[PDB]
Design a protein around this ligand. Structure first.
Ligand SMILES: Cc1ccc(C(=O)Nc2cccc(C(F)(F)F)c2)cc1Nc1nc(N2CC[C@@H](O)C2)nc(-n2ccnc2)n1
Length: 272
């Protein structure tokens, strides 16, 4: 498992601030010498056998991935305690919070470019036979070039395909459903999917045939694509290769994004 990983000596790692929690240990922002900022997930004293298997196994799969749109593993501390998984760090942070804090600040082309990068990372994962299971804007990091990196921070009805909810069938095709939700999150600057509907109401709406409406000022082609990610029949959804191809072609012929889907207003204002 620790094959594709680099072993880092503890003297090279400085933990500075807690930024979250892991399964059995904290997550920190810190600095790595070999200086670069890093995120650090620890496995603290008392962890179980299963926790150790899952922790090192996680580092092992992360080391295997080498792609522009997948979070990069700097290395692992396994020979000393506490054990650590060390990744790159992004000052812009997670995509959901980023978009909510920068509402309306980007061009359509910038937003679609983010989605193309997410899709390319997902195509890579699916090709590598890795099913994400929790694809959502909260699990995507944004670098200072606006490049999105798929990650998994650990624990989602509103993002999950019907077959995954109903009978636990998680595949790259259920990840495609989630990707459609991510497209909607990006184009709305981080709006909550389905707004205040409860989890049960969301599932009932989906089963009844309802789907999320168009975001404001959304290219028609982008809404059509997200709608095709939400087909009930798993086999009819696009594969990630199809999604990447379409997004690449739209970006390369950017006039294609100027045609906007109609937005259904909730409020009427009568003025002269
Ligand atoms: C340390 C760390 C460990 C693991 C992962 C991770 O992705 N494993 C993973 C597992 C399976 C599949 C995939 C994959 F690749 F398929 F998607 C990826 C990410 C981070 N790195 C990290 N964790 C956090 N966390 C976690 C707790 C949250 O509250 C904050 N925050 C930031 N961070 C913030 C600003 N710049 C960076 N980085």
């Amino acid at each position: 498992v620790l094959k594709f990983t680099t072993e880092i000596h503890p003297s090279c790692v400085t933990r500075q601030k807690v930024i979250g929690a892991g399964e059995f240990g904290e997550v920190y922002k810190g600095m790595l010498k070999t200086e670069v900022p890093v995120a650090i997930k620890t496995l603290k004293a008392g962890y179980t056998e299963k926790q150790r298997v899952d922790f090192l196994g996680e580092a092992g799969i992360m080391g295997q991935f080498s792609h522009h749109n997948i979070i990069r593993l700097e290395g692992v501390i396994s020979k000393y305690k506490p054990m650590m998984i060390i990744t790159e760090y992004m000052e812009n942070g997670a995509l959901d919070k980023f978009l909510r804090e920068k509402d309306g600040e980007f061009s359509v082309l910038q937003l679609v470019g983010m989605l193309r990068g997410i899709a390319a990372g997902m195509k890579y994962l699916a090709n590598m036979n890795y099913v994400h299971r929790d694809l959502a804007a909260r699990n995507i990091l944004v670098n200072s070039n606006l490049v999105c990196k798929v990650s998994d921070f650990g624990l989602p009805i509103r993002w999950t395909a019907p077959e995954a909810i109903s009978y636990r069938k998680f595949t790259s095709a259920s990840d495609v459903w989630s990707f459609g939700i991510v497209m909607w999150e990006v184009m709305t600057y981080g709006e909550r999917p389905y707004w205040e509907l409860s989890n049960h109401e969301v599932m009932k709406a989906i089963n009844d045939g309802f789907r999320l409406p168009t975001p404001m000022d959304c290219p028609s082609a982008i809404y059509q694509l997200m709608m095709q990610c939400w087909q009930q029949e798993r086999a009819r959804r696009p594969k990630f290769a199809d999604i990447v191809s379409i997004l690449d072609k739209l970006i390369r012929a950017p006039d294609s994004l100027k045609t906007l889907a109609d937005f259904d207003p909730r409020v009427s204002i009568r003025l002269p």
